[PDB]
Amino acid sequence: SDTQEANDIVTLVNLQYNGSTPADAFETKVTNIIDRLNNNGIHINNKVACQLIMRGLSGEYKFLRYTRHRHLNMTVAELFLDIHAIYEEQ
Amino acid sequence: SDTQEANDIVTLVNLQYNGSTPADAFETKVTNIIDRLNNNGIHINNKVACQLIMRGLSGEYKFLRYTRHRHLNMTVAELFLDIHAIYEEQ
């Protein structure tokens, strides 16, 4: 699309997960956004990506933004493993 | 800051200009964000940058998002010249 990157960035900034949507969808949703943006030359690295994902991660997931401070060099895949683990216990 | 790029991206996505702030401040504000983001490896090119600026450009500036369709390959500087010109007439 002509307005591809801009809409991906706004979607990334307005992520709001609480536990309703399956992690499956939410993961591949964010995985795509970062892939598409990176295909178009906009590289959102793991550090910055995780930050934006954990932002707006509310509910019983809220806290993951607090341990993040100890989690340096955390990967997006790792971060979702955590989210997946939470969803399985619901 | 450790959370620099992420906060720059969210600032860019949540821009809301209507005519209150001087164009001077709003311009260099966005000019910096795009420079900082580009220094850190997040390449926001003119096309996508302008798109994100015109998004949330409300008030008497709204119409610049409509003329944009004729303005292909427009630069961020050009886009602000328009915003500056409108601000001068207020």
Author numbering:
A (entry chain B), B (entry chain A): 261 to 350
Tell me, in the authors' exact words, what the paper reports.
Excessive replication of Saccharomyces cerevisiae Ty1 retrotransposons is regulated by Copy Number Control, a process requiring the p22/p18 protein produced from a sub-genomic transcript initiated within Ty1 GAG. To minimize genomic damage, p22/p18 interrupts virus-like particle function by interaction with Gag. Thus, p22 is identical to the C-terminal half of Gag-p49 and is processed at the C-terminus by PR to generate a mature protein p18, that is identical to the C-terminal half of mature capsid Gag-p4525,27. The structure comprises an all α-helical domain related to that observed in the CA-CTD of the yeast Ty3 retrotransposon, ARC proteins, and orthoretroviruses.
To further examine the effects of the A273V mutation, we determined the crystal structure of p18mAUG2-A273V. The protein crystallised in the same spacegroup as p18m with the same three copies arranged as two dimers in the ASU, but now with additional electron density for the A to V substitution on α1. Superposition of the three monomers shows the backbone conformation is near identical (RMSD = 0.16 ± 0.04 Å over 78 ± 3.6 Cα) as was also observed with WT p18m. In addition, the Dimer-1 interface contains the same set of apolar and H-bond interactions as in the WT structure. The only difference is the alanine to valine substitution located at the interface centre. In p18m-A273V, it is apparent that the γ-methyl groups of V273 now also form part of the continuous apolar network. However, in order to accommodate the additional methyl groups, there is a small displacement in the backbone position at the C-terminus of α1 in both monomers. As a result of this shift, the V273 γ-methyl groups also pack across the dimer interface and maintain the same favourable 3.6 Å Van der Waals spacing as the β-methyl groups of A273 in the p18m structure. Analysis of the energetic contribution from A273 or V273 to the dimer interface using PDBePISA52 also suggests that both the A273–A273 and V273–V273 interactions are favourable and that V273–V273 packing actually contributes more than the A273–A273 packing to the free energy of the overall interaction. However, analysis of Tm derived from derivative plots gives values of 50.7 ± 0.4 °C for p18m and 45.8 ± 0.2 °C and 45.1 ± 0.3 °C for A273V and I269F mutants respectively, showing that these amino acid substitutions modestly reduce protein stability.
